């Protein structure tokens, strides 16, 4: 869990590269678990529940996975992992789990996951 | 009552209403700071295509640190272009982001009519 | 010097009232990608908002405008120079010119109209 | 008058360059009348009436002038002068008095003169 | 046939592209174009305008109705999964080139996107 | 030929999935994508991330690099005036399709589009 957060945080790009899902799945693989793939971040829930994750609710722990549904201009949703203070996708998210203002404004649904 | 003050108070309110729970264009208090037609247009852009150009319309970025940005809103005196006040603003302590705020007087109050980035024509 | 580019450019531009965008001389005043994109957009759809990109108007009194080109001092926002420009003696039009090797080039020009 | 339509037709650009009003006005001034200049095409009715012109209704004649109000993405409206076959502003309009899809879609008010 | 859906569409389009009417304002548009696409386009045209300034379907500002209507040339369709792509050209000299994207929606091909050949902006 | 250029580029691009420098920051992409185009894309990923919040070249947020690299398939380029549109399918299980736009400079990539509906 923790070493997966560490992986993601060690391997960020400066800015999004439209690869939040791959980046977090690679982080999970480093921390022990290989996940069944989907193409798009919004659909990564069942792949996570399958691999032995359960839904969390409440303050984030280091290693937690967020899966966010589409937002205007962002039809594939978003995915990220908490490093202890900062959510991590393909980039380090300084402002929150929502990776941008399209998301912050339209406030789409999300689930968090844990092991 | 100066455009620089309308500007500083607006961005101060904006950052504090920009989080994972709220967003300042949703907030009705937006109309206090931004011209209403501008708010209508912005609401339409955000609801369909997304914010213009991918970035925050008001802050001209996707992502930032709230606490640093809030502690470093640097404002310069307004350029007065006719009756439009253009206020340069810079956010952040390290490698700051620069915007141009266009304010007009609606009723002895300064309302934001436009915000521009410093990027090349696109 | 950015003020200077602004003035030589606008003087040159109103003087020429062939369209000046299609002339190569405009490259002396306008950044090169910027010229490209502008010629392209002019060919495809015409300029933004259907006003002249540089003067921000569909019509003007050229004599008076060439007579009254006011430039205020450039502002620096990092790499970028913002130059306020006014044209005319009656109800002057205001634009902001943005500029960026040894020369200063125009990368964008903005009007003062409300976004809506 | 007719010469105005002719001046317009000869002095066009390959495309719009955002100056429909300057082009139509300089045409009319070659035709005889120097209208009180104004920045926006959408505003030129009070200037034409403050000259020889009167509001036509029905089919267009060679020299007729249309003044069109804002469309989306086009806040300043649009001016044109018929050549007997085509409406003419700063370019030759192959489709009609509306200079593009924004206009044809939004169908804003217009006046012929 | 989607090539035929294409030609049929642009014929109807050009004939409804006048100074009195525009095909997006027509209820008939639903026949030829996917619903969400129409909704989006209408919003676009009402606020900011047509995307990138040009007609979304013809990818131009200005054209001659007669020349275009008598020079609508399609090339054989592409199948990319369930999405059909039909290359179309308009006009007799210096033709304009687009790509029409079509899904089968009921018993019909609906248009879901139109592309220009312009570089990335 | 455009088909050639398209496959060259994608093979190059997916083969660089492993390394630390994202392929767009790497100058060899200039062999494949047009200069202006690359410039604009670098600028945009820098500001807002790529369009639609998805990889601009692959059009997915995640993928089997192995499966895709072994199942790049291409059809005859459509010729639209001086532009070549090459259809490409990746994968052997529910393939993703992109259209790659190229112009003669060498053939170079000026644009790439998905098959998603406009809405």
TrEMBL record, chain C:
Positions of the DUF3828 domain: 2-111
Highest taxon of the lineage: Bacteria
Key words of the record: Signal
Name of the molecule in the record: Putative periplasmic protein
Taxonomic path: Bacteria, Pseudomonadati, Pseudomonadota, Betaproteobacteria, Burkholderiales
Residues of the full protein shown: 31 to 151 of 151
Automatic annotation (TrEMBL), chain D:
Protein name, entry field: Putative cytoplasmic protein
Organism, scientific name: Ralstonia pickettii (strain 12D)
């Amino acid at each position: 869990g923790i070493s997966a957060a560490n992986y993601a945080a060690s391997n960020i790009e400066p800015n999004s590269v439209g690869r939040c899902a791959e980046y977090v799945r690679k982080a999970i693989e480093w921390g022990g678990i290989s996940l069944q793939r989907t193409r798009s971040a919004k659909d990564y829930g069942p792949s996570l529940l399958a691999a032995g994750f359960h839904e969390a609710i409440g303050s984030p722990m280091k290693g937690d996975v967020i899966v966010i549904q589409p937002a205007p201009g962002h039809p594939h949703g978003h995915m990220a992992i908490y490093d202890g203070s900062h959510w991590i996708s393909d980039f380090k998210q300084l402002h929150g789990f929502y990776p941008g203002p399209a998301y912050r404004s339209a406030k789409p649904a999300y689930k968090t996951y844990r092991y | 009552n100066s455009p620089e003050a309308a500007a500083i108070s607006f961005y101060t309110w904006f950052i504090q209403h920009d989080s994972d729970q709220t967003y300042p264009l949703s907030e009705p208090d937006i109309e206090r700071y931004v011209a209403t037609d501008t708010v209508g247009r912005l609401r339409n852009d955000y609801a369909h295509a997304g914010p213009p150009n991918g970035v925050d319309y008001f802050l001209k970025v996707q992502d930032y640190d709230s606490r640093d940005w809030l502690a470093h809103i640097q404002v310069q005196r307004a350029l007065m272009l006719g009756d439009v006040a253009v206020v340069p603003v810079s956010f952040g302590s390290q490698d700051p982001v620069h915007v141009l705020v266009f304010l007009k007087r609606v009723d002895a109050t300064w309302k934001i009519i436009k915000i521009d980035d410093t990027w090349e024509y696109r």
